Amino acid sequence: GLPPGPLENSSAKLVNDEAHPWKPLRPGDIRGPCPGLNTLASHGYLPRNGVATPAQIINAVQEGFNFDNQAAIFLTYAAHLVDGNLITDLLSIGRKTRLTGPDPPPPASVGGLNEHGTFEGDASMTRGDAFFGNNHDFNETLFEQLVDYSNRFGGGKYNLTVAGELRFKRIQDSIATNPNFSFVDFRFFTAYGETTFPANLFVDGRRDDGQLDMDAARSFFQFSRMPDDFFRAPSPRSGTGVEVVVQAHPMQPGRNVGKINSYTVDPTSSDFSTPCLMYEKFVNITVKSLYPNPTVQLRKALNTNLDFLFQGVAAGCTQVFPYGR
Ligand code: HEM
Ligand SMILES: COCCCCCCCCCCCC(=O)O
Ligand SMILES: *[C@@H]1O[C@H](CO)[C@@H](O)[C@H](O)[C@H]1NC(C)=O
Ligand SMILES: *[C@@H]1O[C@H](CO)[C@@H](O)[C@H](O)[C@H]1NC(C)=O
Numbered sequence: 001g002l003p004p005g006p007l008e009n010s011s012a013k014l015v016n017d018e019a020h021p022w023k024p025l026r027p028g029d030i031r032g033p034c035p036g037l038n039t040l041a042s043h044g045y046l047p048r049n050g051v052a053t054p055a056q057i058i059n060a061v062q063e064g065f066n067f068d069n070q071a072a073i074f075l076t077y078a079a080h081l082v083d084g085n086l087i088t089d090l091l092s093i094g095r096k097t098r099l100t101g102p103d104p105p106p107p108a109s110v111g112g113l114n115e116h117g118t119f120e121g122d123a124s125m126t127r128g129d130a131f132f133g134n135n136h137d138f139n140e141t142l143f144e145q146l147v148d149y150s151n152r153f154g155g156g157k158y159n160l161t162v163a164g165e166l167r168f169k170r171i172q173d174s175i176a177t178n179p180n181f182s183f184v185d186f187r188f189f190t191a192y193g194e195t196t197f198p199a200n201l202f203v204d205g206r207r208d209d210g211q212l213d214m215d216a217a218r219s220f221f222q223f224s225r226m227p228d229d230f231f232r233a234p235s236p237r238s239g240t241g242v243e244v245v246v247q248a249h250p251m252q253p254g255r256n257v258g259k260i261n262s263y264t265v266d267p268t269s270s271d272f273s274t275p276c277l278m279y280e281k282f283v284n285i286t287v288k289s290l291y292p293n294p295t296v297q298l299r300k301a302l303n304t305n306l307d308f309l310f311q312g313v314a315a316g317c318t319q320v321f322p323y324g325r
């Protein structure tokens with residue numbers, strides 16, 4: 001279906017309401033590395049089994065959290081192109097599942113949001129790097145480090161100052177312990193944006209002060225659960241304030257080269273100075289590598305989803321056509 005449009009009414013409102021109660025997981029229910037999508041599934045804004053269409057995901061992030069339209073479209077279609085089933089139009093917000101339908105041929109993985117190196121990546125705040133065995137479950141030790149950074153830099157609350165310090169700490173921990181640490185292109189951009197999301201979207205919209213308390217933080221990050229009487233943000237937003245996070249500790253994109261403490265800058269990677277290059281490489285390299293010679297029905301589904309992806313790209317970039325027009 002077409003990408004949904006922006007909210008007709010984007011006011012703050014109760015989103016933890018009678019029609020969207022929190023429910024525990026049933027056997028087979030899928031939760032993944034994103035506490036935003038996990039919470040919408042656990043409140044019934046998304047299907048509770050954690051398998052959804054792109055249009056369902058865009059509608060849920062807007063209705064439940066007031067995520068802005070352009071960001072919703074870009075992230076949803078990027079995730080769907082690399083992790084979703086383009087024929088059935090279904091994406092798992094977590095582990096690979098037969099529930100997304102019959103698979104395309106390799107090398108396409110349709111691995112859900114849990115698939116390492118497509119969307120999900122290293123130096124997550126409350127999830128471990130895939131090298132350590134689990135890139136998707138809430139990690140109590142990592143969350144306690146988020147609390148400690150909130151106590152030291154946020155007076156007990158998570159804010160953009162905390163995000164700047166913790167983002168850099170998680171990069172330095174990955175450099176020191178993960179010999180396969182990768183921090184380039186798509187992951188380089190999304191890792192910085194994700195650290196603003198709690199301050200911009202998990203803060204009750206009646207305050208919208210960018211100060212997230214640790215009870216609310218645990219409720220979202222561990223339990224996929226809105227605080228009692230949670231109001232969504234009072235206007236559409238996503239990564240507002242990412243400039244503060246970067247400015248705290250500016251980093252070049254790069255990777256460890258098979259050893260710890262070997263972080264090597266990648267001059268071929270995009271960075272914040274080349275945002276159009278990030279889009280071009282995502283399409284010409286990442287998507288194309290998963291579908292190099294697609295059959296007629298797959299080509300048509302790719303071209304449709306790539307057009308939808310381009311709707312979320314900031315004005316100024318040129319659309320690229322890996323399968324022709
Ligand atoms: C619009 C579609 C969305 C998609 C496809 C999506 C997908 C993802 C994925 C795959 C990750 C894991 C990346 C990683 O850390 O390795 C992630 C992280 C995250 N997402 Fe989402 N996301 C979306 C929207 C949102 C929204 C609306 C929120 C908040 C309301 C949110 C909050 C977060 C946070 C806080 C993290 C970082 C988790 C951590 O580092 O511990 N996301 N997202
Ligand atoms: C800096 O964090 C990035 C997280 C993305 C959140 C806002 C997505 C907005 C989509 C425009 C992207 C333009 C482009 O890709 O060239
Ligand atoms: C929009 O929704 C809010 C809160 O749900 C409501 O109070 C407000 O009156 C609505 N605006 C319009 C134009 O209906
Ligand atoms: C190691 O890094 C490569 C890309 O550089 C990635 O494709 C692979 O999945 C990574 N594996 C783990 C578990 O970190």
Ligand SMILES: *[C@@H]1O[C@H](CO)[C@@H](O)[C@H](O)[C@H]1NC(C)=O
Nearest residue numbers: 127128132134139140141142
């Ligand atoms: C959580 O993260 C810590 C710190 O990286 C790690 O040592 C531990 O094995 C991870 N997993 C669990 C289940 O705690």
Ligand SMILES: *[C@@H]1O[C@H](CO)[C@@H](O)[C@H](O)[C@H]1NC(C)=O
Nearest residue numbers: 153154155159160161162210
């Ligand atoms: C984070 O909280 C601390 C302590 O209240 C404060 O000094 C800092 O200005 C806050 N940062 C932001 C961006 O709100």
Ligand SMILES: *[C@@H]1O[C@H](CO)[C@@H](O)[C@H](O)[C@H]1NC(C)=O
Nearest residue numbers: 277280281284285320321322
């Ligand atoms: C992407 O491919 C198009 C041709 O299809 C080309 O114009 C563009 O330069 C490519 N960009 C990159 C970064 O490879």
Ligand SMILES: [Cl-]
Nearest residue numbers: 006068069236
């Ligand atoms: Cl919007």
Ligand SMILES: [Mg+2]
Nearest residue numbers: 120121122124
């Ligand atoms: Mg990760």
